[PDB]
Curated annotation (Swiss-Prot), chain B:
One GO process term, biological-process aspect: peptide catabolic process
Protein name: Leucine aminopeptidase
Organism lineage: Eukaryota, Sar, Alveolata, Apicomplexa, Aconoidasida
UniProt-reported outcome of changing residue 368 to L: 6.5-fold reduction in catalytic efficiency in the presence of Co(2+); 854-fold reduction in catalytic efficiency in the presence of Mn(2+); substrate affinity is slightly reduced; impairs formation of stable homohexamer
Comment field on protein domains: The L13 loop movement regulates the transition between active and inactive conformations by repositioning Lys-293, which, in turn, mediates the rearrangement of the binuclear metal center.
pH dependence: Optimum pH is 8.5. Active between pH 7 and 11. Optimum pH is 8 for the cleavage of the Cys-Gly dipeptide.
Binding residues for Zn(2+) 2: 281, 286, 306, 368
Localisation per UniProt entry: Cytoplasm
Cofactor, how bound (note): Binds 2 Zn(2+) ions per subunit. Two metal binding sites with different affinities are located in the enzyme active site and can be occupied in vitro by different metals. Site 1 binds metal with low affinity and can be occupied by Zn(2+), Mn(2+), Co(2+) or Mg(2+). While Zn(2+) has the highest affinity for site 1, catalytic activity is the highest with Mn(2+) or Co(2+) and less with Mg(2+). Site 2 binds tightly to the metal ion and can be occupied only by Zn(2+) or Co(2+).
Record: residues binding Zn(2+) 3: 301, 303, 306
Length: 509, 510, 518
């Protein structure tokens, strides 16, 4: 519980905003039939041309003569639909009120992907950050299913919100016009919950390691649990020693922060039909240890992001605790520690013993996440659960296989993997199934210990890491999502909060 | 067609062995009801013990010898076990009072052996074959295998047994005892054909770049086409110029060997129901060009293998031309050239024009394979085919994604992707479907040219290369098989000939 | 003259656009005291708020239209601020009931705009012209600018607006239309009218440089570049001579010839001359580095960060000089004679290339030990400097993408100037100020000269101990000027715009101002 300091200026908690300006936005959805009113603020048409870089045409009736004139085909023809392109103009409407009207081009393909919709939303937010506005109205002249509509709102909220916690006027109304509006209305408050879970995960990830350490991260988790009435248990070093979690404890040996193991539980009021464990990797800073991250491209400056899997799991607890699904029991776990260089650190070649009795030869101290996950998986399996799903920024190799856009899913059970893929489709957080190739298993055969931590011949590191983790799950359906490539948004210089909505869709559906 | 030489000692053709010692082996399949005769050579029982950890060996087969049966009694056999890969050797006198040789190979503790496990069994067999002067091998299947895995066993046996001695200065009989022997007989000569398709690919790949250059490789293709009875043409520099294949021509500018484009065709006698183009990357040596492969881990000594895709397509032309499927027209295509460093080479930054009119800004001369493939794809599509499948050692990133066992497949058509994945199952050459992620397409936008060759921001190079290639297919189902990771067997120091059986099963299945 | 090809698809010239759409723009400058007519296209106010950081927009001009005046009232504008580079677009109907677009770009709160500030202003303005179809732009200056900065505004607007599509084929921009009219309202308009056509000449010299730099090495090689220089001379009526390998052997230019030994393209040395009618008071040689592609040679550019894919730009010095010849040939200054020189070649890997360790002899008889084949620029420039000095000139100025170390000293905004004569250096810094192309004076440190001592040759090409390679290269060059005022401008860091992925055409206006100032 008390956060240790080196000097009295060392922070002792992670600052967290709960009530955000997004929560004060009043949202109304109207049917397009009947016409759009243009009375105040900024009005944006979402427009495609199914062709390439083709002209903007507005098909919706607008109940304002001045604005209709501006929106005539002969004027809008000047502008083109290239994806993410935008224009907006201030003008007087019929009431001589000054209103801003424009568009964001949605390209020439009728079904937009999640990536295309993010580009549309980015261009919208750029206008929001550049204009003082009480109101934004968005007119849909593109087709969107209910899930993609929800994703439009969650991304708009997340991208719009600015995190100012470490620095020393938002709209108050959102109108949406869309054909068959009544079917979309239910998505609004679901989007607002999914926004906050994602935004909350992002806050934990962006919090630097001096603020977000194993003690302060577990304290934040207890505070979350108290606000949502979840049960919670934080296991400290003496308890972890009794549980014999030698793999996880070895990783944290060189840190000034004691290991803390987070275990939150949501349990439905009714019968419990399904029991799930969600396991997040929780390394609050990864130096690499004695295998220090010193090579070109190692990015040691990004390594506060190595607890992103723990953050996604706590963002999912927010969503779950809020929307309150029936018939389930969810355990949210995370073996939290910090990987540092010290006279007290574990070393390359050390032989260590996991909580299931397996001895492990450490070949590289910067493969610490699979060690802390090993003992977390043994813990999760002893809970007697139906599914275990871990999420982790585990292998740099992911940037060379799927890149920055799709996470990789690996698993021991095809039904569970298909469930994750489905949740990927409905959360619009993209994941792709990659294989656990059994032919590589013999590279983990240690001359001295029961098993090696790493391969010294196989380059397919993300597959080798998966084979290692699978050794710690005996008889339960298990899937492992590797988000090393997708967790950080390099262009925007901030986290994605990747996985909160994926994991929540999985629990809910 | 004459091979240019720098000195008179330079080779002017690739040495190719067509009738191998494997082809001389007389193969007989006998029904195991009937019992096993011993006598000759070496007799090997393939025994498992499913369930039991490392169970004892129990020989179930009837053995038509009183002596050898008394030796193979459970009593004597209990001391040995079935650990996958194990083997033992026995010496005895038979009913004839003649000394014979017998043993077993352990097949483990699952009842249904996997592909890579069958390979481990075959490797153990080959070890016994390499060690001793034998006239005959007999193999008794006391395990269950379907037709498909039986064929795989034979192909793998043949391939592993065959030793390539072309650059240095066997049994005569194979007997096989198996249950329902009549159902397996058909597989024997199919395995023999597939073995040769694969070994033929391997001979072209293993041949070094001084022997195997764009002129000797296309000469070897013409010779193969002549032996099979395939239509062929080789397009030379003057025709390629007329067709405006500027991306492919740029890659070969720095080479002393003129570019040669290989086009073979197999056409069925009947109605032609499906038209297919199979396109193989044909770089006979990849130095990297001015973006020389000088970084640690770049493996420039391996780069004779950069024509592995062309080799797989030619091996497949061997199988197709031999098996003669009906209802099909197949075009076998390779844009063959050599990527070298010269006053004549293309340079990083050069803007080149492909045969479909697209200008391309070269960002790295070592991404040459996609440039040669782009022109070959425009050529394939102009043929009016229904499917285009390319195979290529395209990106070293495959080592980090799937490793050395599974190739990646990418494409623009789910049905074609599914046919490829089916053929991967039936060929036993493993492939995994990977996504063409359209979000990375913006990183090929060029300031000056129609498109960039490479991404300067995205590290997922196997996906970026696929996005590039997709720009050269306008309106045809297409898929792309990246074999960079799987083509060379680093453990055995030789090619796998990967892809020949995959592509053949794809054509045959259609 | 004939460009050699490896295959028949290899290009045999650099494509060059001379009559660009900017040349079709009719420009009219009007005095602001008469008020603005707002009748069509887009009208943009350049607006600041001196003192008030991110202060409000307030329009100060009279506008001769009741409707537009109503829209532009302070109450209406107060939602908007003047932060540098910010902009807004308005749509209304004027008194003649015709639709009209009106806007502003913010010019900040400091009444004196740097070159970089004015560049941000132009960039925002150009974003308003892109992705819009307009026949007319008018710009209202409600800020204070001197004559040079008003000219810089126009040069920059022209250069940034112009899009280079010479190598597009299936991806030509369908929606790219250019304005046909530009109106400018400003205080004391009569005094700025002279800057308009000067801006147009400066834009083109600069765009022309940019076209040659951006042309890839397979289009722009030593033969095609020297051919484009002849064409340029012919259009301008300059005297010209292109020296070929046999002439360069007779002149004993061994350092320059060794660099191009490995190329399939013969070395070509460009010499153009502009000479005033009447009295010639100053003779100047401008020497540009013209390596059309730099692979590094046997010291190949293989290290991480070496950017071999950028090296078509290594003739950027020769482009600047040729763009200068354009402006000089057009503007016709009196009392000068200008020689525009470039030792053009390509640095390649071949059986024929020069090697690390080779000892070559320059045209002044000095023997040089090659320590690195990728220090090729100063070998070419050594022979060009000897040639320039033998012309009997008063000043020699060279310009060159010489050393990557410029990125570590001055970075991407300012070029460095080195030289042997303080008056010349000051004339360059002065022209830097009037051209608005920023240069910083850097020292030639004589204490490093001993590290060029060669055990076998008269001199080493490179230092093996000193890492300040921009200084060492200048000490090397200084050995090839015996008794003439000389300066050297290293543009390796400024020549390429990495953000916008195109050349700046840096140097053309700096060199022209220098010539015209004299
Ligand atoms: Zn880590
Ligand atoms: Zn290659
Ligand atoms: Zn250079």
């Amino acid at each position: 519980s008390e956060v240790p300091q080196v000097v009295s200026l060392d922070p002792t908690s992670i600052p967290i905003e709960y009530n955000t300006p997004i929560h004060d936005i009043k949202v109304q959805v109207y049917d397009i039939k009947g016409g759009c009113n243009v009375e105040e603020g900024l009005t944006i048409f979402l427009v495609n041309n199914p062709k390439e870089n083709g002209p903007v045409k507005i098909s919706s009736k607008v109940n304002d003569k001045q604005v209709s004139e501006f929106l005539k085909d002969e004027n809008m023809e000047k502008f083109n639909v290239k994806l993410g392109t935008s224009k907006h103009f201030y003008m007087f409407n019929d009431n001589k009120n000054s209103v801003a009207v424009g568009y964001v081009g949605c390209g020439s393909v009728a079904d937009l992907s999640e990536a295309d919709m993010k580009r549309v939303v980015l261009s919208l937010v750029t206008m929001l950050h550049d204009n003082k506005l009480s109101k934004l109205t968005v007119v849909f002249e593109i087709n969107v299913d209910k899930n993609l509509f929800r994703f439009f709102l969650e991304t708009l909220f997340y991208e719009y919100m600015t995190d100012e916690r470490f620095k020393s006027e938002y709209i108050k109304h959102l109108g949406v016009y869309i054909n068959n509006a009544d079917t979309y209305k239910e998505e609004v408050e679901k989007a607002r919950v999914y926004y906050f879970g994602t935004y909350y995960a992002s806050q934990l990830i962006a919090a630097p390691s001096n603020y977000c350490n194993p003690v302060s991260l577990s304290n934040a988790a207890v505070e979350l649990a108290q606000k949502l009435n979840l049960e919670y248990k934080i296991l400290g070093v003496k308890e972890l020693e009794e549980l014999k979690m030698g793999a996880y404890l070895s990783v944290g040996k060189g840190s000034m922060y004691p290991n803390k193991f987070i275990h939150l539980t949501y349990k439905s009021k009714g019968d419990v039909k399904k029991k799930i464990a969600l396991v997040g990797k929780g390394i609050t800073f990864d130096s690499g240890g004695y295998n220090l991250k010193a090579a070109p491209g190692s990015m040691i400056d990004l390594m506060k992001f190595d607890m992103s899997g723990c953050a996604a799991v706590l963002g999912c607890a927010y969503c779950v605790g809020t929307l309150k699904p029936e018939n389930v029991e969810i355990h949210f776990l995370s073996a939290v520690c910090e990987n540092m260089v010290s006279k007290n650190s574990y070393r390359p070649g050390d032989i260590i013993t996991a909580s299931n009795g397996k001895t492990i030869e450490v070949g590289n101290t910067d493969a610490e996440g699979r060690l802390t996950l090993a003992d977390a998986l043994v813990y999760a399996e002893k809970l007697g659960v139906d599914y275990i799903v871990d999420i982790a920024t585990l292998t740099g190799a992911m940037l060379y296989s799927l890149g920055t856009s799709y996470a990789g899913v690996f698993g021991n059970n095809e039904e569970l993997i298909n469930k994750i893929l489905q949740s990927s489709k409905t959360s619009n957080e993209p994941v792709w199934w990659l294989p656990i190739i059994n032919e590589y298993r013999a590279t983990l055969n240690s001359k001295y210990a029961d098993i090696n931590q790493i391969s010294s011949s196989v380059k397919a590191s993300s597959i080798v890491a998966s084979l290692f983790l699978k050794e710690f799950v005996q008889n339960t359906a298990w899937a492992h999502i590797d988000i090393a490539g997708v967790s950080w948004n390099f262009k925007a210089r901030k986290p994605k909060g990747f996985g909160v909505r994926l994991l929540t869709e999985f629990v809910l559906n």
